[PDB]
Amino acid sequence: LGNTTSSVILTNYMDTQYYGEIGIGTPPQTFKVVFDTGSSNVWVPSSKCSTACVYHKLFDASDSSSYKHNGTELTLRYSTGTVSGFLSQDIITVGGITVTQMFGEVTEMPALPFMLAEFDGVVGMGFIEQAIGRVTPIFDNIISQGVLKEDVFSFYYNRDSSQSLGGQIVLGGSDPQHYEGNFHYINLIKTGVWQIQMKGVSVGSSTLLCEDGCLALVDTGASYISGSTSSIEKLMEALGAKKRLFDYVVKCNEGPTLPDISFHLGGKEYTLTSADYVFQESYSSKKLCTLAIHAMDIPPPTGPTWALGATFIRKFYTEFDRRNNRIGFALAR
Numbered sequence: 548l549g550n551t552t553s554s555v556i557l558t559n560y561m562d563t564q565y566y567g568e569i570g571i572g573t574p575p576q577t578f579k580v581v582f583d584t585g586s587s588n589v590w591v592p593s594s595k596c597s598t599a600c601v602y603h604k605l606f607d608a609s610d611s612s613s614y615k616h617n618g619t620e621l622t623l624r625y626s627t628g629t630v631s632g633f634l635s636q637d638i639i640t641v642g643g644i645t646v647t648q649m650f651g652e653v654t655e656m657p658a659l660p661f662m663l664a665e666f667d668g669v670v671g672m673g674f675i676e677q678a679i680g681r682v683t684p685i686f687d688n689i690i691s692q693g694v695l696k697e698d699v700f701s702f703y704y705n706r707d708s709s710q711s712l713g714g715q716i717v718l719g720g721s722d723p724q725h726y727e728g729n730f731h732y733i734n735l736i737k738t739g740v741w742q743i744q745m746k747g748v749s750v751g752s753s754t755l756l757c758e759d760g761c762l763a764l765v766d767t768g769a770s771y772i773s774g775s776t777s778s779i780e781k782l783m784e785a786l787g788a789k790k791r792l793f794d795y796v797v798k799c800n801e802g803p804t805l806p807d808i809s810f811h812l813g814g815k816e817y818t819l820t821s822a823d824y825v826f827q828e829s830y831s832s833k834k835l836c837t838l839a840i841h842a843m844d845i846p847p848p849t850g851p852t853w854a855l856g857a858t859f860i861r862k863f864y865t866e867f868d869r870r871n872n873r874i875g876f877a878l879a880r
């Protein structure tokens with residue numbers, strides 16, 4: 548019956564990491580995961596893990612009655628780091644939906660960057676076209692069940708605060724308690740990737756970048772808004788922000804006066820004020836404040852592209868429509 552509309556509560560770790568809980572096996576073994584529209588594979592650390600594994604929950608296949616062996620070796624390369632392991636199959640529970648899934652048991656999890664990760668693994672919300680080993684993604688297997696009210700999933704990311712809700716993922720629809728107004732939809736360029744066409748990025752009331760059009764990957768697993776090194780250099784010059792490591796900074800006192808950043812997607816302009824992209828941790832003229840925007844040279848086929856991560860998602864509640872191959876945005880509350 549197509550009437551299921553399940554949700555997973557997320558935890559906000561310092562506006563950079565948003566993770567929820569999944570259960571693997573019989574009885575269920577729980578894991579903190581990132582739900583990533585940028586990738587299409589499910590992976591958690593394995594009990595068979597020989598640097599970062601000490602700090603994370605490990606999947607023990609020998610404690611699962613529903614486990615089915617596979618063992619195909621697998622390497623999952625990310626913009627942040629790389630993991631390796633082998634494939635396994637078991638039952639996975641995501642907010643009351645149970646699915647037989649092929650996932651990766653990770654045996655190579657480096658302390659850089661995974662020691663910094665508050666989550667154990669990743670649940671890829673991408674398409675099979677981007678899946679490593681051509682492994683069927685979890686959302687495709689939920690679709691096949693015919694339980695969902697709609698072949699959609701939504702993301703709400705809150706601003707860090709207090710016993711408030713860090714975020715929420717809705718499988719089968721959207722939560723109108725978390726958005727204002729109505730959704731505006733933009734069709735995907737092509738199926739296989741959660742990427743839409745962008746028609747310009749403007750600083751203030753004038754179009755500075757992406758004048759001849761560019762790409763925007765709507766990435767739930769990205770912490771920040773990102774662009775090509777060249778684009779981010781031009782943007783940061785316009786903002787009067789200076790480079791300090793892989794971070795861009797402004798003097799904390801100058802933060803509240805930085806201009807609005809606008810992304811032209813579909814029919815409209817999606818605007819971020821300085822309060823949306825500056826980590827305003829002080830207001831002193833002596834201290835330096837971090838911007839939630841950075842350079843990221845995404846390699847082909849996906850890149851060169853901009854990526855609208857948690858910085859964007861916090862402002863705009865996002866709906867990912869698999870039935871219509873489109874992305875919807877509405878102002879978040």
Ligand SMILES: C[C@@H](O)CN1CC2=C(C1)c1ccccc1Nc1ccccc12
Nearest residue numbers: 564565581625627660663664768769770
């Ligand atoms: C939660 C989401 O909004 C942002 N996340 C995604 C993510 C982050 C931060 C990260 C944090 C600390 C260390 C490493 C990583 N790298 C990594 C690798 C693979 C897949 C996802 C990640």
Ligand SMILES: *[C@@H]1O[C@H](CO)[C@@H](O)[C@H](O)[C@H]1NC(C)=O
Nearest residue numbers: 616617618619634649680681
């Ligand atoms: C693992 O799963 C893949 C799925 O394509 C299958 O082709 C392969 O034969 C399986 N391997 C084992 C050892 O079960």
